[PDB]
Design a protein around this ligand. Structure first.
Ligand SMILES: COC1=C(OC)C(=O)C(C/C=C(/C)CC/C=C(/C)CC/C=C(/C)CC/C=C(\C)CC/C=C(\C)CC/C=C(\C)CC/C=C(/C)CC/C=C(/C)CC/C=C(/C)CCC=C(C)C)=C(C)C1=O
Ligand SMILES: NC(=O)C1=CN([C@@H]2O[C@H](COP(=O)(O)OP(=O)(O)OC[C@H]3O[C@@H](n4cnc5c(N)ncnc54)[C@H](OP(=O)(O)O)[C@@H]3O)[C@@H](O)[C@H]2O)C=CC1
Ligand SMILES: [Zn+2]
Lengths: 342, 125, 230, 96, 115, 208, 86
């Protein structure tokens, strides 16, 4: 294990866990939790960033002195990837954009970049690679996001045969777009749902569950070439889910059906924003698509994680979306939503 | 007014020590040995209580010596072994006591260096 | 040799009587683990190994080179547990890194039979662990979990086997020389003609004797100094 | 007396250079490794040995109160030179 | 005998009465604490934690030690009610960022040297 | 003996000795010992039950008039059966003098609060309770003063470790400051400085 | 199933071990003559109690108190454990 990489201490901030991890995509929603969980145990974390260093400041207190190293990288450059994965025994890939920018389409962030990372980290002698795809990744899906996810999953498996591939479904948390998107809709007046959300089933998963699952998969010797699906303990119809979201936020729920072509036109209209779009056509397709059921894949309970129900963590995301009148309401006051389980 | 409490003294629930550092610890009650590099005996007068040595590792940065043991530096001084034992008992620590070792009285005689027939005679001086 | 020396002691005892607590008979040991092993019922010597060549061999810090793979059947499973890479390590199938005497609180019995305990100065390096903890974990994995989980429990078991092993700094013992002399008079094994020659003939031999000293550069310097004048 | 390791890293006066499989070298990528270039062992090895016509010499490192504590060096051994234990300067008697 | 001076209680009965009174006060306070501090726990969780903290000290048999424990619990209750405490202080009881430390022999043997 | 040695004052020594005898004669019920230190510092050891009478007499008596309490603190001596030593320092402006009153207690025995005698004690007794865990009976508002909210244990006690048992850090997952078991990057390095040769013969103890 | 070893923990100067001592003074020798291959470990005891230990196959053990036993009682107990009884 190369004596310098032998675990020491009580697993705390000043300990040595034996992990040296390069976390691509550490400046996003999932990346902050992953870096927090790695730096809790005393891991050496290498953060490749392309954004303004100001935007990485929140990751500085996550480690001890010298335990977090920040390095500039370019997704189209392989010498840069070599530079940032030279000394790591773990590489985690969390790179991904919900919308397509002018310089990066879905195929760049979900096929080219993951494949380049897998190839370079295999060349460099990195022991472990963790890749994140979607639960609904499919070659013939109506969303190009998921088509690119499936293609990139195959490419990573080809470039790094012993990679662990993790397939979560609709992560929810404080900085999660999925919980926020429903909350955001209240400003307009009515909630537009295709078929009133009666033909969609969702199985959202907690952010901390996904971070813990990644961390445990790193420490698991038999999780090498496996493929995991990270899903929550409950399945909801989209209508009931959005109704529960609006009840926790104490906002008046006014759902109305909107036809598919009208919603696609709205998404296209919102797509022309030079900044982060409020919604896109791809987001509209992904929202009203039912979560797949994959019983043949190992889950969070195979990694020792007990999935957190949304009923226990919804208030910590949605209390910010309340008015002053309902700001002090307790968690058990909202009557959990109806689950369509089996 | 006196109430005649009948039980053994026990203050663990008031000290605020985490239970891990109450049950898994072993203290040593002893009179420290004289440092063999010197002849003074002034450091062998009082009893000492000290805890068991825990893990120390190397800091990845700078290579300093890191510990996670909060009692790794604590040393208590007592007049007599009975006081040390009473303190350890009322604080709930398992202890090991060692009886004080004193140097035995030795019969010195300068004239023996020049014995008429004895082996003690010095070959040099 | 032991029978003859016991005969000398018996002649002294019968001629002069017993003055009280004198205990003419004495055995001088040179190995730290020997007296405790004998106290525990361990059979002295490697003869039973040669008599019944085993398939699974546990080398517990055994670096004397007494038993090699020529003295064992093929496909013999050799497990070495210790702290040094010496004679016993490169001939093993599984290596278990143990703790040296400076890295554990452990009991040793000297030539007098007095029992003393070491204290932890530093922890074992890398992934090395306490030896009895290695054995207890191995017992749990194999299904026959040993009753003791802590050091005080293992010392209670030690007291159960031989109670004198927990009486630190006590050296009082009972004299049973008469019974041992009677039992020694039974067999009459013949004495060899070979002259009595000790292993440590000279000062150079004194330095490097065990695995800790064989790995010491200071002892190598001492050996070089006593062999070469310079 | 600088010299590089097979990995291209400078070796310090202390002699420590990270091993090939040591991850800690990552702390120098995109940055540099601080190495002092004036090796004291080499610089003191260049000073000429002082020849003095007495058995016992005195050294205080120069500068009086700005040097080190004053020490006395015996110079009876002719197979070697008397070396100051503070400054490293060498002294000998005129020999041969 | 043993010649001790009490703090408040002369025997274990009065000490138990004071313990019950303090328990009642904490039980009443828990819902207000959950409301004021905007905690993401339920009232059931808070009352369970109060019971767990009370049961941590169930083995005490000295009325003076029990009196001091009640004094400390009353200090903590006064502190909580007046909002001297912050949400971090209340949440310190639940150890939400502490990874579970195992208790069986084998896991301890695997992780390190500490018993 | 002149230039570098601190000069003596025998007049003040005599006055303090006489006043200590005075105090001991007036209150035999509580006064256990009276001492005058070499640098003229009067000390009166008493029984705990006499905390309130003694101080009251000392602050009220016409010949005493110690109306001001400099400070009140405690000393931890683990080898004593009564662990804690309670020390009151009093100043008399009328007679321009100082006096020290000392008593003892252990972990489970309360001391009478002296807020009634001196208003200044309030925070001093709160501080003693916080740092040492000595309870004061009949105290107006007794609670922690120096330590953090919810802090367990008493820091000034000899047994308590220098760096404590917990530290604080900000955690982003829970979005708040959390308390965790202390881990140190560099351990405090304990030094053994005590010389093996005796320094002061005048304080040598009998060889037991 | 069978005897593997015997352990006799006798206390050096306590009255309750006195009879056991007599046994070792007189009857231990011939008992070792009869059993040349059976380890009968004679060990010293602390102030608690005299005892006898029997070990069987696969590490099964149980002990018998010898407190205040006379030498004949000691040898009777030893022959009972040495035989296929109890
Ligand atoms: C967490 O992520 C997200 C954000 O981040 C902060 C957003 O801002 C965001 C969109 C933010 C909205 C509030 C933008 C909506 C714009 C206003 C509410 C005005 C809308 C009403 C009209 C434009 C004004 C006049 C009204 C007409 C009907 C006439 C979304 C969707 C989101 O998801
Ligand atoms: N509901 C969910 O959130 C779940 C997420 N998915 C997948 O899980 C992964 C993490 O998701 P999430 O954290 O929410 O996404 P985020 O948008 O929050 O973060 C994406 C990360 O990838 C980086 N990144 C994006 N594009 C590029 C690029 N062209 N070049 C370099 N870096 C880039 C970002 O850096 P920068 O900030 O500088 O742009 C950022 O750090 C992603 O791969 C996502 O697709 C899995 C199922 C659903
Ligand atoms: Zn010099």
């Amino acid at each position: 294990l190369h004596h310098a990489l032998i675990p020491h201490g009580k697993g705390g901030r000043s300990s040595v866990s034996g992990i040296v991890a390069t976390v691509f995509g550490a400046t996003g929603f999932l990346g902050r939790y992953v870096v927090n969980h790695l730096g809790r145990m005393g891991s050496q974390v290498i953060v490749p960033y392309r954004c303004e260093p100001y935007d990485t400041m929140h990751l500085r207190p996550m480690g001890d002195l010298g335990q977090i190293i920040f390095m500039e990288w370019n997704g189209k450059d392989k010498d840069s990837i070599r530079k940032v994965v030279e000394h790591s025994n773990v590489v985690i890939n969390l790179v991904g954009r919900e919308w397509e920018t002018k310089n990066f389409d879905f195929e760049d962030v979900f096929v080219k970049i993951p494949h380049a990372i897998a190839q370079v980290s295999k060349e460099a002698g990195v022991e472990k690679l963790i890749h994140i795809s979607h639960l609904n990744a499919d070659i013939k899906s109506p969303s190009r996001y998921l088509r690119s996810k499936a293609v990139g999953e195959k490419e990573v498996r080809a470039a790094f045969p012993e990679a662990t591939i993790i397939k979560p479904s609709d992560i929810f948390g404080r900085e999660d777009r999925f919980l926020n998107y429903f909350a955001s809709m209240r400003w307009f007046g009515g909630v537009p749902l295709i078929s009133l959300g009666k033909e969609t089933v969702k199985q959202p998963v907690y952010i901390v569950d996904v971070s813990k699952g990644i961390i445990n998969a790193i420490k698991d010797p038999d999780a090498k070439g496996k493929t995991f699906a990270f899903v929550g303990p409950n399945r909801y119809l989209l209508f009931d889910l959005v109704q529960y979201i609006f009840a926790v936020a104490y906002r008046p729920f006014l759902p109305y059906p909107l036809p598919h072509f009208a919603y696609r036109w709205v998404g296209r209209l919102f797509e022309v924003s030079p900044f982060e779009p409020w919604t896109t056509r791809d987001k509209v397709e992904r929202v009203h698509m039912s979560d797949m059921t994959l019983p043949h894949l190992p889950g969070l309970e195979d990694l020792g994680i007990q999935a957190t129900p949304l009923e226990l963590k919804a208030i910590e995301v949605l209390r910010r979306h309340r008015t002053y009148r309902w700001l002090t309401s307790e968690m058990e006051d909202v009557k959990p939503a109806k689950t369509v389980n089996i | 007014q006196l109430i005649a409490v009948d039980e053994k003294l026990d203050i663990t629930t008031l000290t605020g020590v985490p239970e891990e550092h109450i049950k898994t610890r072993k203290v040593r009650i002893f009179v420290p040995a004289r440092n063999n590099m010197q002849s003074g005996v002034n450091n062998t007068k009082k009893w000492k209580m000290e805890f068991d040595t825990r893990e120390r590792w190397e800091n990845p940065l700078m290579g300093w010596s890191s510990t996670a043991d909060p009692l790794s530096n604590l040393v208590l001084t007592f007049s007599t072994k009975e006081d040390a034992v009473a303190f350890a008992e009322k604080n709930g620590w398992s202890f090991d006591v060692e009886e004080r070792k004193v140097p035995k009285p030795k019969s010195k005689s300068y004239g023996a260096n020049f014995s008429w027939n004895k082996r003690t005679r010095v070959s040099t001086k | 040799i032991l029978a003859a020396v016991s005969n000398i002691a018996q002649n002294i005892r019968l001629s002069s009587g017993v003055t009280g607590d004198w205990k003419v008979m004495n055995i001088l040991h040179r190995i730290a683990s020997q007296v405790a092993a004998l106290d525990l019922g361990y059979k002295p010597g490697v003869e039973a190994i040669r008599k019944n060549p085993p398939k699974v061999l546990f080398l517990l810090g055994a670096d004397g080179g007494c038993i090699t793979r020529q003295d064992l059947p093929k496909d013999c499973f050799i497990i070495y547990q210790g702290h040094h890479g010496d004679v016993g390590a490169p001939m093993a199938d599984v290596i278990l890194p143990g703790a040296a005497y400076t890295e554990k609180s452990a009991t040793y019995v000297n030539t007098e039979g007095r029992a003393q305990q070491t204290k932890v100065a530093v922890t074992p390096p890398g992934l090395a662990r306490e030896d009895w903890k290695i054995i207890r974990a191995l017992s749990e994995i194999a299904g026959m979990t040993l009753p003791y989980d802590t050091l005080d429990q293992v010392r209670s078991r030690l007291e159960e086997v031989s109670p004198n092993l927990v009486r630190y700094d006590d050296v009082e013992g009972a004299n049973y020389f008469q019974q041992a002399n009677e039992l020694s008079k039974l067999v009459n094994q013949q004495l060899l003609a070979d002259p009595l020659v000790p292993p440590q003939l000279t000062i150079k031999d004194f330095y490097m004797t065990d695995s800790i000293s064989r790995a010491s550069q200071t002892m190598a310097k001492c050996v070089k100094a006593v062999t070469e004048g310079i | 007396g600088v010299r590089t390791s097979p990995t291209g890293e400078k070796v310090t006066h202390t002699g420590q250079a990270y091993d090939d499989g040591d991850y800690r070298r990552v702390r120098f990528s995109d940055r540099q490794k601080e190495v002092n270039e004036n090796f004291a062992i080499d610089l003191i090895a260049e000073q000429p040995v002082s020849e003095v016509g007495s058995r016992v010499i005195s050294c205080d490192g120069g500068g009086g109160a700005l040097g080190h504590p004053r020490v006395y060096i015996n110079l009876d051994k002719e197979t070697k030179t008397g070396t100051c234990g503070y400054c490293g300067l060498q002294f000998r008697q005129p020999h041969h | 005998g043993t010649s001790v001076k009490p703090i408040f209680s002369r025997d274990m009965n009065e000490a138990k009465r004071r313990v019950r009174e303090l328990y009642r006060a904490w039980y009443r306070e828990v819902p207000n604490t959950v409301h004021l501090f905007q905690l993401d726990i339920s009232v059931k969780q808070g009352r369970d934690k109060v019971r767990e903290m009370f049961m941590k000290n169930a083995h005490v048999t000295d009325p003076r030690v029990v009196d001091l424990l009640v004094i400390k619990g009353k200090m903590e209750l006064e502190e909580t009610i007046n909002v001297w405490k912050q949400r971090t202080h209340i949440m310190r009881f639940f150890h939400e960022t502490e990874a579970p430390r195992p208790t069986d022999f084998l896991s301890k043997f695997y992780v390190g040297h500490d018993p | 003996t002149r230039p570098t040695i601190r000069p003596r004052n025998d007049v003040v020594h005599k006055q303090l000795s006489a006043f200590g005898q005075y105090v001991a004669e007036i209150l035999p019920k509580y006064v256990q010992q009276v001492q005058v230190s070499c640098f003229n510092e009067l000390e009166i050891f008493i029984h705990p039950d006499g905390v309130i009478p003694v101080l009251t007499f000392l602050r009220d008596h016409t010949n005493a008039q110690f109306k001001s309490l400099a400070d009140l603190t405690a000393v931890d001596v683990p080898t004593r059966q009564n662990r804690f030593e309670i020390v009151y320092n009093l100043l008399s402006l009328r007679f321009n003098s100082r006096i020290r009153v000392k008593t003892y207690t252990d972990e489970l025995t309360p001391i009478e609060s002296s807020v009634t005698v001196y208003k200044a004690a309030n925070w001093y007794e709160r501080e003693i309770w916080d740092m040492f865990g000595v309870f004061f009976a009949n105290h107006p508002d007794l609670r922690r003063i120096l330590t953090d909210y919810g802090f367990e244990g008493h820091p000034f006690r000899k047994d308590f470790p220098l760096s404590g048992y917990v530290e604080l850090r900000y955690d982003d997952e829970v979005k708040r400051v959390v308390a965790e078991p202390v881990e140190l990057a560099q351990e405090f390095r304990k030094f053994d400085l005590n010389s093996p040769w005796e320094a002061f013969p005048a304080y040598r103890q009998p060889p037991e | 199933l069978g005897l593997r070893e015997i352990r006799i923990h006798l206390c050096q100067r306590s009255p309750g071990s006195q009879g056991v001592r007599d046994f070792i003074e007189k009857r231990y020798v011939e008992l070792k003559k009869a059993n040349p291959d059976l380890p009968i470990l004679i060990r010293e005891c602390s102030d608690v109690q005299p005892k006898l230990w029997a070990r069987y196959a696969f590490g099964q053990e149980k002990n018998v108190s010898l407190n205040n036993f006379s030498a004949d009682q000691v040898t009777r107990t030893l022959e009972n454990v040495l035989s296929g009884k109890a």
